[PDB]
Amino acid sequence: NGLTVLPPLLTDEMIAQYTSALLAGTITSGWTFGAGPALQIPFPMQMAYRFNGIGVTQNVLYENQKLIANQFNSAIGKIQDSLSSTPS
Amino acid sequence: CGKGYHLMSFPQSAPHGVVFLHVTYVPAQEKNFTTAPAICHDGKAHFPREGVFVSNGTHWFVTQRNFYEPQIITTDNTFVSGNCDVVIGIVNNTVYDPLQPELDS
Amino acid sequence: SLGAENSVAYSNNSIAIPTNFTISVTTEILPVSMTKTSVDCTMYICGDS
Known part of the structure; x- marks a missing residue:
């Protein structure tokens, strides 16, 4: 033997806590935080604002917010399936 | 280039190294407000050009998104696209116009 | 303690806008060079012999 493995300083829970903090900050305050x-x-x-960033005016969102929300929700939902289904 | 909005940086020397003085713009003294995606005047929705609609609780104003500089809504702080039905959260208010006053004077 | 706990007062029509700014100057340090050392193999291992 003679070997060791040392525990990470931040546990998985604190790493997920930082990930949660970043997600909450992004969702509530955008980049401003x-x-x-x-x-x-x-x-x-x-x-x-993130549509103005790419050269698309604000109205394009406000007149399609339903479609955009549906597409974003569907894409996030399909990410879970694309991740679990593909093993590599 | 440092934490905050980057303005500019100044290089410095060091033994076997370099030092950067990062001059950044950090906002402070934030103030609560109420906003609207669009403001409906006469059935046409007006969206801001380069700022965000805010309300002091009595009147509506447009201001640059990073600094509170309340200005009066006009046909030059906004642009018209679409009718008030499609937009969600639209609020009713008045859009001032510079042309009609001088035209009528 | 990972950090101070905070909660953002989100609502469907509330915003926060700054009214003043603070100019911050911060320092970044980046090593650029290393001591250029050269070693004589024969004199190190064997030497005069």
Whole structure:
């Protein structure tokens, strides 16, 4: 023998806690929480800003918010299946 | 380039190394508000051009998303696209116009 | 303690906007070079002999 394995300083639970913190910050405040204090903002305006970022005006979201929410939800749901189903 | 919005940085030397002085813009003194995706004037929805609609609780204002500079809604702080039915969360308010006053003076 | 606990006052029509700014200057340190050492193999292993 003569060998050892040392435990990680941060457990899996604290790593998932940081992941939860980042997800909550992103959902509630967009990018504003990475430049300093978190500024709350409703999610559709956050997505409208992220549409201005790519050169699409805000109205394109507000007039398709139902389609965008459905597509995003379907894509997230399919990610779980694409992950479990593929073994490699 | 540092934490915060990056303005600019200044290099420095060090023994077997370099040092960067990162000058960044950090917001502070945040203030709560109420917002609307769009503001309906006469059945046409007006969206902000480069800012966000906010309300002091009495009147509606447009302001740049990173700094509170309340300005009065006009036909130059907004653009018109679509009718008020499709948008969700739209609020009713008045859109000022510069042309009609001087046209009527 | 991973960090201070905080909760963001989210709602479907609430926003927070800054009214003042703080200019921050922070330092990053990055090693660029290393001591250039050269070793004489014969004099190290054997030497004068």
